[PDB]
Every structure is written in structure tokens, then in C-alpha cells.
Design an enzyme around this catalytic site. Sequence first.
Site, PDB file in Angstrom:
ATOM      1  CG  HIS A  98     -65.172   3.053   7.205  1.00 42.85           C
ATOM      2  ND1 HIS A  98     -64.178   3.765   6.578  1.00 42.85           N
ATOM      3  CD2 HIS A  98     -66.283   3.106   6.409  1.00 42.85           C
ATOM      4  CE1 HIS A  98     -64.646   4.235   5.422  1.00 42.85           C
ATOM      5  NE2 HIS A  98     -65.949   3.835   5.297  1.00 42.85           N
TER       6      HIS A  98
ATOM      7  N   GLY B 115     -55.947   7.306   2.655  1.00 42.81           N
ATOM      8  CA  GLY B 115     -56.110   8.576   3.336  1.00 42.81           C
ATOM      9  C   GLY B 115     -57.180   9.482   2.709  1.00 42.81           C
TER      10      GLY B 115
ATOM     11  CB  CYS C  34     -61.862   7.429   3.637  1.00 40.55           C
ATOM     12  SG  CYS C  34     -61.655   5.840   2.795  1.00 40.55           S
TER      13      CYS C  34
HETATM   14  C1  LIG Z   1     -59.886   5.272   3.038  1.00 40.85           C
HETATM   15  O1  LIG Z   1     -59.235   6.322   2.930  1.00 40.85           O
HETATM   16  C2  LIG Z   1     -59.999   4.656   4.257  1.00 40.85           C
HETATM   17  N1  LIG Z   1     -58.933   4.133   4.894  1.00 40.85           N
HETATM   18  C3  LIG Z   1     -59.113   3.546   6.106  1.00 40.85           C
HETATM   19  C4  LIG Z   1     -58.170   2.948   6.888  1.00 40.85           C
HETATM   20  F1  LIG Z   1     -56.797   2.885   6.442  1.00 40.85           F
HETATM   21  C5  LIG Z   1     -58.494   2.378   8.119  1.00 40.85           C
HETATM   22  C6  LIG Z   1     -59.834   2.418   8.537  1.00 40.85           C
HETATM   23  C7  LIG Z   1     -60.781   3.038   7.731  1.00 40.85           C
HETATM   24  C8  LIG Z   1     -60.400   3.561   6.534  1.00 40.85           C
HETATM   25  S1  LIG Z   1     -61.384   4.405   5.275  1.00 40.85           S
HETATM   26  C9  LIG Z   1     -59.704   4.244   1.926  1.00 40.85           C
HETATM   27  C10 LIG Z   1     -59.596   4.851   0.475  1.00 40.85           C
HETATM   28  C11 LIG Z   1     -59.091   3.787  -0.508  1.00 40.85           C
HETATM   29  C12 LIG Z   1     -57.705   3.273  -0.100  1.00 40.85           C
HETATM   30  C13 LIG Z   1     -57.111   2.944  -1.477  1.00 40.85           C
HETATM   31  N2  LIG Z   1     -57.746   3.931  -2.381  1.00 40.85           N
HETATM   32  C14 LIG Z   1     -58.854   4.391  -1.813  1.00 40.85           C
HETATM   33  O2  LIG Z   1     -59.636   5.147  -2.400  1.00 40.85           O
HETATM   34  N3  LIG Z   1     -60.740   3.187   2.037  1.00 40.85           N
HETATM   35  C15 LIG Z   1     -60.425   1.913   2.302  1.00 40.85           C
HETATM   36  O3  LIG Z   1     -59.278   1.513   2.513  1.00 40.85           O
HETATM   37  C16 LIG Z   1     -61.628   0.937   2.367  1.00 40.85           C
HETATM   38  C17 LIG Z   1     -62.057   0.773   3.844  1.00 40.85           C
HETATM   39  C18 LIG Z   1     -63.385  -0.041   3.950  1.00 40.85           C
HETATM   40  C19 LIG Z   1     -64.556   0.859   3.673  1.00 40.85           C
HETATM   41  C20 LIG Z   1     -63.515  -0.622   5.373  1.00 40.85           C
HETATM   42  N4  LIG Z   1     -61.245  -0.347   1.789  1.00 40.85           N
HETATM   43  C21 LIG Z   1     -61.071  -0.527   0.451  1.00 40.85           C
HETATM   44  O4  LIG Z   1     -61.112   0.460  -0.286  1.00 40.85           O
HETATM   45  C22 LIG Z   1     -60.697  -1.778  -0.006  1.00 40.85           C
HETATM   46  C23 LIG Z   1     -60.545  -2.972   0.675  1.00 40.85           C
HETATM   47  C24 LIG Z   1     -60.178  -3.955  -0.210  1.00 40.85           C
HETATM   48  C25 LIG Z   1     -59.850  -5.273  -0.092  1.00 40.85           C
HETATM   49  O5  LIG Z   1     -59.971  -5.835   1.186  1.00 40.85           O
HETATM   50  C26 LIG Z   1     -59.410  -7.163   1.424  1.00 40.85           C
HETATM   51  C27 LIG Z   1     -59.525  -6.046  -1.226  1.00 40.85           C
HETATM   52  C28 LIG Z   1     -59.449  -5.439  -2.475  1.00 40.85           C
HETATM   53  C29 LIG Z   1     -59.776  -4.077  -2.541  1.00 40.85           C
HETATM   54  F2  LIG Z   1     -59.724  -3.451  -3.785  1.00 40.85           F
HETATM   55  C30 LIG Z   1     -60.139  -3.361  -1.431  1.00 40.85           C
HETATM   56  N5  LIG Z   1     -60.460  -2.071  -1.272  1.00 40.85           N
END
Ligand SMILES: *[C@@](O)(c1nc2c(F)cccc2s1)[C@H](C[C@@H]1CCNC1=O)NC(=O)[C@H](CC(C)C)NC(=O)c1cc2c(OC)ccc(F)c2[nH]1
Lengths: 302, 302
Positions: free
Chosen positions: B42, B144, B146
Site C-alpha cells: 500500500h 511511518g 509500516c
Molecule cells: C503505516 O505506517 C502506513 N501508513 C501509510 C500511509 F500513511 C499511507 C499509505 C500507506 C500507509 S502504511 C501505518 C502504521 C499505523 C499508523 C498508526 N500506527 C500504526 O502502526 N499503517 C496504516 O496507517 C494502515 C494503512 C492500511 C493498511 C491501508 N491503517 C491503519 O492502521 C488504520 C486505519 C484505520 C482506520 O481507518 C478509517 C480506522 C481506525 C483504525 F484504528 C485504523 N487503523
Amino acid sequence: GSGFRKMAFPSGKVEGCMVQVTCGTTTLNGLWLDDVVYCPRHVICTSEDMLNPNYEDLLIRKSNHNFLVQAGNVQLRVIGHSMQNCVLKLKVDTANPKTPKYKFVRIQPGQTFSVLACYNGSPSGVYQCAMRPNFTIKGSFLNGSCGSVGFNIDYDCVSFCYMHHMELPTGVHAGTDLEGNFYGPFVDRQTAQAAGTDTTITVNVLAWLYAAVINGDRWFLNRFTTTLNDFNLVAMKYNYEPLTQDHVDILGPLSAQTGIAVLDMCASLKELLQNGMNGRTILGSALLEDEFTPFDVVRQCS
Amino acid sequence: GSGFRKMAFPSGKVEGCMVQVTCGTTTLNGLWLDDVVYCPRHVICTSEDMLNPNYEDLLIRKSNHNFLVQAGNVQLRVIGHSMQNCVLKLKVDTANPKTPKYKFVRIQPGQTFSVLACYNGSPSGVYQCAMRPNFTIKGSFLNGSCGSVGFNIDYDCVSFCYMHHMELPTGVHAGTDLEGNFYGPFVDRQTAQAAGTDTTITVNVLAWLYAAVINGDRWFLNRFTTTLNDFNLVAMKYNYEPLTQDHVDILGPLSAQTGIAVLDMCASLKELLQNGMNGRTILGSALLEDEFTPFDVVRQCS
Ligand SMILES: *[C@@](O)(c1nc2c(F)cccc2s1)[C@H](C[C@@H]1CCNC1=O)NC(=O)[C@H](CC(C)C)NC(=O)c1cc2c(OC)ccc(F)c2[nH]1
Ligand SMILES: *[C@@](O)(c1nc2c(F)cccc2s1)[C@H](C[C@@H]1CCNC1=O)NC(=O)[C@H](CC(C)C)NC(=O)c1cc2c(OC)ccc(F)c2[nH]1
């Protein structure tokens, strides 16, 4: 994001400096930085020397050529030696190509650091520790661990703060800074040594209460404040360490982030001490945690 | 004797593999082994896409030139790309000289690993996690993070078992193996996702009770034994995983070291489940710890 997990610093930059130092059949860990290897001076002791060694006299019998320094299985030739307090400095013929930017720092009671536990020059694991108020650490160390180091990392610079020497009868550990001066009242000899009574690291408990607030656990906040002197006097009655001016200063960023004045949080802690935990919990536990520093909270929670 | 800490593997062999991967305004971490960089797929997503992303479509719409891979401050050249489940593989034209021996394993629930938490390709922290029975991990991961990886080290061989993708609303974490298959029922889309109900990893609680005995904490022991079936009946009532005969066998070394038969230690644990801990602590914790495996305990405590 809010696991409040103990987190060590990545150990690679220190792994790149670990060597083994041997006299006879006694092998300790050493720290190789530039063209110097630092290790505990008692690598030079035989079983019979250890109960009350005369280090100066024992060293008189040593030459450069009695010391085997190895990086893995590669020998580094020793070209000079000197003793500084409880450490040996061995000058070697090769400058460590993996030498990071580094400093030697003396940590304060209550501060934390990572330990790279090593056996025969070989890294076994990394964990986070606090320097207790009685200048011991609750480490995890087996036979062979001496010369293992503790460190902090600040943007590419490694601050070396600990070198391991001793286990006390209580199971705790004692050591030196990288200039060879013990933390606390301990000496490097094969005796049972008693640590002062241990106290709770108040500044870290407050950091932990801030962390709870940041994550929305704030049932324990009260409407009262205290003076620092009054708080310190009450803290000591509960076997809590008094706050220093440095402690108030380092809680400042957490105070700003939650809008809760340091002395209001002290008054909340004061009530938890006096009234007990009510039955209830904080970030999951009925135990107040004292080995998360203000810096650790800032680093991993905001 | 040893003391007892949550211990991670030295992370140096993994730090030398971490890079930064950018596509558009999205930056995350990749793992650079030989001439391939592994990262979460992603990275290819922008904002709109993230809710119901058609990844196959999104990937065919990119070229090699769209992927900015950086090792320190040196751009690597992407010459090829593919997708394996939720993981993106970027072929580059330079091989990583610090690539350790490695393999890719999928761990079972209850197994532990070390996580190297990274931001913008830079190692920030290391900690020890367990794969929960509900396939979450309780980590400390922020925006950040991921592409951070989990791993075990086995005789100079790195086994990579985890890559980081997601934080759930509850603050636990979810991710994949290095084959790109999620642990658990989670999906890489921007949605709030719940986990199944968690259970306690019973073989690990037993290992930790053994660690406690080895370090002189014994108050919880009793003179009783149980059968394995009767232990399991009670365990399951309290939402603890059943203990298998294989679990019993894996506790053998710790049983031998302490002289406490496994089924005796189970009777202790049953009394702790039924009666609670009655204000006392074990190894300084007021809760039963389930994130040390029998191997973790053996390796740390002899
Ligand atoms: C990552 O580091 C990633 N960040 C991004 C990004 F900013 C843009 C594109 C792709 C990615 S991967 C991050 C790690 C998370 C952030 C907070 N603490 C972490 O460990 N992963 C995410 O942000 C993922 C991305 C999805 C796999 C597409 N999303 C979530 O972790 C996420 C989304 C959520 C929502 O969505 C409405 C609601 C509640 C929730 F808890 C939640 N979590
Ligand atoms: C080190 O690893 C060192 N080991 C040696 C060695 F085998 C030969 C020469 C020099 C050194 S330094 C070790 C680390 C200990 C081992 C157990 N867990 C540890 O953390 N340090 C020691 O063994 C030191 C060595 C002195 C500095 C010379 N001694 C003790 O830690 C020690 C001695 C003790 C006695 O002696 C009668 C009684 C009680 C006690 F708790 C105790 N501790």
C-alpha cells in the site's frame, strides 16, 4: 502507538564494537572504539587474586603480549595498556572501522539505558534497564557477561554509560561508567556487597501517569496541588525518591502536552500513595511502573 | 541468579537491511536483501484508493521510475517490481553487502520475535513481542512504522516472520509474514477492524513461572499436582490456551533445572487462576506474563 512497551535502542552500532579480551583462560567482553579497547580491569585476575586484588601490582606483571584481544576469531594486536580506575584501556594496532560517533556519559539515578548482553565478545540480547536510586540495575546477566555495555542513542551518536562488573547477593547488578568509576559504593573484588535500600523512581511514575492521561486514562486526577518540598517529604515516607529540579524540568514537555502542572500531577500521585489504588488500575495494571522515563514517553507516545 | 528481562535479539543484522521506499507522497520502510526490496504494497496507494483499493490495477498503473528507494541518502534504481499477496517486491540493480543469512518463516500463535521499529528507513527501537492467539501483536508502532519487520536469530541466520501494516482501534497491531499473508482476519484497507477474542498463552505463563523460580520467587508453589486433562479443563474456563503434551515436553529442561515437575507447576498456576495473586507480585509483575516462550527462558536463564 500506546502499547507502552519497554523499547531498547537498536543495538547494531554497539554490536560493531564488541570484542573479547583474554588473559590466560579468563575471557571478558571489551568495547573497541577507534584504536582503544575498554574492558574491566579484573580480566587480569586469577581465582586467587580476586578476593582482594592489588591491581597496580598485578598489572606490573602484565605486558602488551599477555593480552589476547579478538573480534570474533580475528586477533587485534595490543600495542599499549593502561588502567583507569576499574577499567583497562588496551591500545590496539587497528582502528575499528565501525566506530560510531560516541561519547562517554555518566548517567543519573532513575535514568534508563539499553544493555547489550554479550558472552565471549558475542551479542546475546538487548534489553532496557533503569539505574536504580541505590545505583544498582536489575539486569539479566550470566557468568561471562562482564564488559557488556549500556548505552543511549541520540541521532547517530552512541552515549556509552555503563559497563558490567558485578552481581550482588540480592540478584541485582553493579558496574562503572566508561571511565571506570563505579556507580554507587561498590568495589571490584570477590565479596558480598550490600546495596542501599531501593526506592521507587518518582519521576518515572509521574511520566507513566502522564502517559496514562495522554491515552485517556485519567480517573486519578484530583483538583489539588502541592509544593515540591511538601511532596518530597511525603514521598520519602513511602520509599519514593524525592524529585530533583532536573526531574521537574524533564516532565515539562509532558505537562505542556496534557496541560496538567507537574505539581498537580504530584498531588494526584500523593493521593494514590495515601489512599491506595482504590481497587482500580492504570493503563491496565494495579502496579505503578517506574522504569519509563519522561524521555521514553515522549519518544514512544508523542 | 540471572535476573529476568524482556530481551530482544541484537538487531544489527536487520538494521543493515532497512531502507526507505517512497511512491508519490507516501513514505514507508523496506527490507533490502540481495537485490530485492520488500515493503507493504500500500505504498502504491494515495488517499482515495485506501478505502477499497484494487491493488492489481494500482500496481499495473506504476512504473519502476515511480518508486524512490533510499539507503541512507543514496537512491537505489528500481529495475523491476511484483506483488506477493500484501507485499511489494522491488528489484534493484545493487545487491546489499550487509545481507545476513536469512529465511522467511510464518510463526505460530504463542511464538515470540523481536521487532525493529523503523521510521523513514531509520531504526528507532527494538522490542520483543508475541504473536497473540487472536493473531494481533501488542507493539509500539506509530505513523511511518509500516514495513518494520519482526525476526528471530538462529545461529547467525535471521528468520523474518513479520512485516508491519496496521494499528487496530484498540491500539494493538496487525501485519503479514514476508510472503505477504496476513496473520489473522485483517485486511490492508483504511478501515477500523476488530480482532477475535484473545486468550492467554499457557505454555508461556508456565515458562515464566519457571523463570520466577530460577530467580528465587517461589511463594506461588504448592505441594499439589494435577492431571494434564484437569489442568486444561480449568485453563479453558479462564480463557487460557490448552497445554499439549508437546508443550509439557518443551518445558522439560526447565523442569529438570528446577526439580519442579510440569504438572506440579500446573497445579500452582491453577491455584493462581482460582485464587488470584492476593496483592503479591511475581518477578515484579502483578499480572501473569505470557510473552516468554520456554526457549526464551532457557536461553536467558541457562
Ligand atoms: C503505516 O505506517 C502506513 N501508513 C501509510 C500511509 F500513511 C499511507 C499509505 C500507506 C500507509 S502504511 C501505518 C502504521 C499505523 C499508523 C498508526 N500506527 C500504526 O502502526 N499503517 C496504516 O496507517 C494502515 C494503512 C492500511 C493498511 C491501508 N491503517 C491503519 O492502521 C488504520 C486505519 C484505520 C482506520 O481507518 C478509517 C480506522 C481506525 C483504525 F484504528 C485504523 N487503523
Ligand atoms: C563477570 O562476568 C566477571 N567474571 C569474571 C571472571 F569469571 C574472572 C575474572 C573476572 C571476572 S568479571 C561477573 C558477572 C556476574 C557473574 C554472575 N552474574 C554476574 O553479573 N562478575 C563477577 O563474577 C564478579 C567478579 C569481581 C568483580 C572480581 N563477582 C561478583 O559479581 C560477585 C562475587 C560475589 C561473592 O563473592 C564471595 C559473594 C556474593 C556475591 F553476590 C558475589 N558477586
